[PDB]
Amino acid sequence: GAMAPSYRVKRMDIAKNDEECVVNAANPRGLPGDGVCKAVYKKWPESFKNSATPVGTAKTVMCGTYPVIHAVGPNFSNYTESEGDRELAAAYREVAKEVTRLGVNSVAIPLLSTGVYSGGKDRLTQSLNHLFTAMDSTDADVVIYCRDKEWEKKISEAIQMRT
Ligand SMILES: [Cl-]
Ligand SMILES: [Cl-]
Ligand SMILES: [Cl-]
Fold this sequence. Notes:
Layout: E1 7-11, E2 22-25, H1 36-43, E3 58-63, E4 66-71, H2 81-102, E5 106-110, H3 124-135, E6 141-146, H4 149-162
Parallel strand pairs: 1-6, 2-4, 5-6
Antiparallel strand pairs: 3-4
Helix pairs in contact: 2-3
The structure holds chloride ion (3 copies).
């Protein structure tokens, strides 16, 4: 575990993370995809061997000794708000299980279902709060990656509020 487990947020490409493992915002079929998923595919393409896994689940594949945790959030274009919310909470709980199993001291994580899976809605708070529900009981240092300046400010504020 980390000496004093923390939450941080960085505005940069998760493919250049400084953590012991990464969470991919994966699709269920293990395809290269776009956004985070495409950056992860370019950096760790070996990790997409048998990475296909259902919505609401996480599947880890090694790239050398570096773990890639393929987390499949729901596409809110396809799910109702109610059912999408259940599956988004589930994917984060499976991430917490994998991070614990691997014994890592840090993890890089994107906000699942906030990009092309958002169904055109702002899901910062929804996705962030499910991340906390899952990861609060783990002792890994969590580093949340985003791309938007206003999102970085809002995520930083949400972290500080709890402290
Ligand atoms: Cl960057
Ligand atoms: Cl997404
Ligand atoms: Cl973002």
